[PDB]
Each structure stands twice: as structure tokens, then as C-alpha cells.
Write a protein that binds this ligand. Structure first.
Ligand SMILES: O=c1[nH]c(=O)n([C@H]2C[C@H](O)[C@@H](COP(=O)(O)O)O2)cc1F
Ligand SMILES: O=c1[nH]c(=O)n([C@H]2C[C@H](O)[C@@H](COP(=O)(O)O)O2)cc1F
Lengths: 285, 287
């Protein structure tokens, strides 16, 4: 069977071959395709891309932060992961017109939507217990009680809350599916920077599937990634061509180190990537 | 150049060969694949399937009803289209524990979520003006002013509102995309009855894209159909095998008959399907 990575690499090649030039919200330029889909086996392997190092600690730490329901960049920052720090800075907030906001306050982005969808956002320090729909606990409950259900969805796209967020979500929704004791997940990603974002994003949702599989006693099945605007920044086309020469090495395995009963009880040291041997690290703006 | 109907037919074959048996809430049994995606050109052709007659009057009438923001099965019924009638009936409403509610009252389904997302649903007769987000007008505005936008989304999946709905939306969200003066659309469909629902669902969203292209002065591009649980009900197998042996005839064209200024302005008789001559209707039992 071909390496799972060839799916991502063949997406890159497709956008180079067939993507069209499209300007962007910043002004750097992209090659773009609309509508793509790839399937990554989660069976006895973990699709952490090998042809360039993926920031695994960021993936895991960010996901734990979502699961907590945090909308405070500082709480992620204190764990050594700075990827949301800019969006919560004083200048950034002011330039969205959020001048009365405390620094760190991303507004109602993924952690809030996942744990408290539909509640009124107040600030990042407010008490939201028992408010809004806990979609993440809902998905886990349905998987255990009704695995056949075709409505196992967690949605982060909330039109009312869109103007309040520091950044509109890229991961608009995901869906879970159970057959034959195997849990699968499909992510609808509205916009994917193929060089810098997508490898990270594939890791997050594969990891979210391993976690829910572990707690519901199921085996990980497939991760299906669906893209809206799939794009390569003009200034990555060269770096990417470097990457396309590299032979994928076999994906690592993901080990969960103890038996965990509730999604909230997971911690970073619960997880060990085994046998990750990626190619030479490649920097990208 | 291969016929676009082969995309749909290919999917049927894929599920028959590789789908796994999976029970559903309806007790019927299905063969199921999770995650599929097909692409339909809208360039000078409209993908209304030809290997069986599709209910076009239904497609068009149901979309105009969504657009008007109606949640009243009776308003669609009066136009001759009965597909939401069962869901807005005494017996059914009762069985969802909505003893209180009036016949026709589907709750906050597509029409409400498209024009009033996040507003407080009362009943099917309330005036919702200026409440919730008008995601449909918002898509149109963004297309006119900033066609490069990677956020042109319309979502009908509203966790908060699911308890009040006659049933949860199959069409969870769509996304629009513009390049080279061409408007494309991607539907995320969480659950697809490949026999009975999908051919209709393809024509609904192809039609919505033609409409929005018309008012924004763009040309229709591609319709990308993404599926979650793509399934065939076991009692559809025999009729789909008959369908698989028919030869696709050329897709029709869709014509819009006047220049139209606002999406709320379109009426049924503004549209003409031209050259639609399908293979006969194929009855398939509802689950
Ligand atoms: O998790 C993410 N992954 C990702 O690839 N992007 C990329 C997509 C796009 O290149 C940009 C966000 O911009 P826009 O809102 O215009 O699509 O970031 C953003 C994320 F949050
Ligand atoms: O537009 C639709 N298309 C469709 O294919 N279904 C099918 C999918 C599934 O067979 C059933 C809805 O069931 P559930 O909610 O269990 O997925 O109806 C329903 C619609 F409204």
C-alpha cells in the first residue's frame, strides 16, 4: 500500500500543476485550488508528516488547550507554545477594534465553541460552566451510546460570534463515524496553507481522533481531510520543490501511556511519539 | 471529455464494491463509506441527472422556499411540492414530543438558519426581520466586494437549535469561492442517501450557485459535493443496479429569463431547464 504522506505530497503537486493565481487578504499571492480531499489511515500509525519536521509539541499542547475551553493565548503561551500570542497582543486587538479587551483574550474561538457553543461570550476569564452546548462531550456520549449516528458533529463556525473572534476559524467543523469498532473523523477545513498550516492541522485532528478512540474503547480508523481553498503562497513554491524530492519515511506510532477515562483528564506526558524520523528541517515564512 | 454524471455513478459503484454494512436509525440497513467527494462542472451545463428523472419542480420550489426564509411546510405544499409535508404533520410532530406545535411548523430548519442564524425561534408565523445573521445576504455582499475572501460560508448546522428541529440539517454548510470571474460552491453534506437524496441535493446547490452567480455578475464554475456518511439503503440496491446500466444523456442547460437584482426577487418562472429528457423515473422506497 502507498505511504499515507504521498496523499499530501500529491496535493502539493496538483496545486503546482493546476492551481490558479489568486490574491490574498495580505498581498503575497497564492496558487489555489478549491475542493480537495485526502484519507489518512490511523491504523497502527500516526500521520505526522516526515518530509519536513512538524511541531508536535505545539499540536498536542494546542489541542489540550482547546479541550480545556480556554480562549486565553497566555494559558497556551505558558506551555512554551506561542502560535496564538500575536492574535492576542494589544496592537492586534486594537487593530480589530477590541480596545477594551485584556491582552491574551482571543474572543470565542475553538475552545469556547467546542465546550460552550451558543453561550454569550463575556471575556476569557468568565465562568461558562453549564452554558452553551458542550459539543465535545456530546460527540463522546453519542459514540458510546449510538455509534451508528450520522450526526456526530462538532462545529466551530458560529456566524453570530464571527465578528468577536480574533481570527475566523479555519477548521469549520468535523464529523465522526463508527463502523466495526473503528472511529473515523472528517475535518472540513475552509482554507489551508499547504506549506505551513496543513501538516500541523492533519496532526491535530488525527490526534483528536486517537484521544476520542481511547476514551470510547474504539480503534482509530481513518482521518479524512477536506479542503475548501487549498493554496500555496508564491514564496513557498521553491521550498516546496525542495520537499518533493524527499522520500517519505514510515510514519511514527502514537502511544497513549495510561488508561484515561475522561477527555479532560488527558495531559501532555500521556503521549509518546515513537520512531519519528523526519527529513532535514525546512523553514517557511 | 467524460460526462459529469459518471462522477455520481462512479460513487454508487464504489459504495456497492467497498461499502461496509452499517445499520441506521431507520432499521433499514445500508452499505456505507465515510468521506467522498465529487466535482460537477457548471460551465455551460447544469448537472440534473439523466439516468433517472429528477424532480426539478421540487428542487426549484424548495430552494425558493428556503430563500424566502419560510419554516412552514404548508407554504411549500401549496406550490405542489410535498417533500416536507410528513415532517410537518400532527403524528410526526407529536412523536418528537412537540405536542404544542401547529401542523406545518418544521422548527428552525434551513430557511431560518440561512436568513436568521442565532435568532430565537418562536413559531413559523413570527416576524424575524433584523434578528440573527442573514448569512445568505452576507455571502452575496462578500462576493460583490471581496471575491478573494476565504470565508464565504453559509452554515445551517446550529447546535443550539437542533432540539427544536423537525430533523437535523443534512447540508451542514456550504462555502463559495471565486477566481477568474467564476463562482464555485462546496457543500458539506453530513449524510447522503445516495439513491433518493443525493441527485436532488446536487441539483439544489448547483441551482443556488447559478442564482448567486447571476446576481453577482459571475459565471458558474464547479459544484464540489463532499459527503460524510455516504450510503446505499439495502432495498435500493436492485433499482440502482438498473440505473447503472443506462447511458447518460447530455446534461440540460439552465436559463434565467430576466436580469434579477436581489436574490429575494427570483420567482419560479424566471428559470427554464432546456433539453432535459431523462431515462424514466426509478422509484426507491423512503426509509
Ligand atoms: O489552522 C490553520 N491552518 C492554516 O493553514 N491556516 C492558513 C490558511 C490561510 O493561508 C490563513 C488564514 O487566512 P484566511 O482567513 O484568509 O483564509 O492561514 C490558518 C489556520 F488557522
Ligand atoms: O437532503 C437530504 N439528503 C439525504 O440524502 N437525506 C438522507 C440521508 C439519510 O439517509 C437520511 C437522514 O437521516 P440521518 O439524519 O440519520 O442521517 O436522509 C436526507 C436529506 F434531508
Amino acid at each position: 500500500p502507498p505511504h499515507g504522506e504521498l496523499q499530501y505530497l500529491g496535493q502539493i503537486q496538483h496545486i503546482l500543476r493546476c492551481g490558479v493565481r489568486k490574491d490574498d487578504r495580505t498581498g503575497t499571492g497564492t496558487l489555489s485550488v478549491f475542493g480537495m480531499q485526502a484519507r489518512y489511515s490511523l491504523r497502527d500509525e500516526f500521520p505526522l508528516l516526515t518530509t519536513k519536521r512538524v511541531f508536535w509539541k505545539g499540536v498536542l499542547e494546542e489541542l489540550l488547550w482547546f479541550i480545556k475551553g480556554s480562549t486565553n493565548a497566555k494559558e497556551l503561551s505558558s506551555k512554551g507554545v506561542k502560535i496564538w500570542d500575536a492574535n492576542g497582543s494589544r496592537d492586534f486587538l486594537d487593530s480589530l477594534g477590541f480596545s477594551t479587551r485584556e491582552e491574551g483574550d482571543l474572543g470565542p474561538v475553538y475552545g469556547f465553541q467546542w465546550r460552550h457553543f451558543g453561550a454569550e461570550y463575556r471575556d476569557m476569564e468568565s465562568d461558562y460552566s453549564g452554558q452553551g452546548v458542550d459539543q465535545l462531550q456530546r460527540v463522546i456520549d453519542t459514540i458510546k451510546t449510538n455509534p451508528d449516528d450520522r450526526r456526530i458533529i462538532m462545529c466551530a463556525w458560529n456566524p453570530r460570534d464571527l465578528p468577536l473572534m480574533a481570527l475566523p476559524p479555519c477548521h469549520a467543523l468535523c464529523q465522526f463515524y463508527v463502523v466495526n469498532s473503528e472511529l473515523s473523523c472528517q475535518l472540513y477545513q475552509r482554507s489551508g496553507d499547504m506549506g505551513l498550516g496543513v501538516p500541523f492541522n492533519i496532526a491535530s485532528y488525527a490526534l483528536l481522533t486517537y484521544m476520542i478512540a481511547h476514551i470510547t474503547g474504539l480503534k482509530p480508523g481513518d482521518f479524512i481531510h477536506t479542503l475548501g481553498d487549498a493554496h500555496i503562497y508564491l514564496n513557498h513554491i521553491e521550498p516546496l520543490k525542495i520537499q518533493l524530492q524527499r522520500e517519505p519515511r514510515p510514519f511514527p506510532k502514537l502511544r497513549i501511556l495510561r488508561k484515561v477515562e475522561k477527555i479532560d483528564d488527558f495531559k501532555a506526558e500521556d503521549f509518546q511519539i515513537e520512531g519519528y524520523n523526519p527529513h532535514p528541517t525546512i523553514k517557511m515564512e
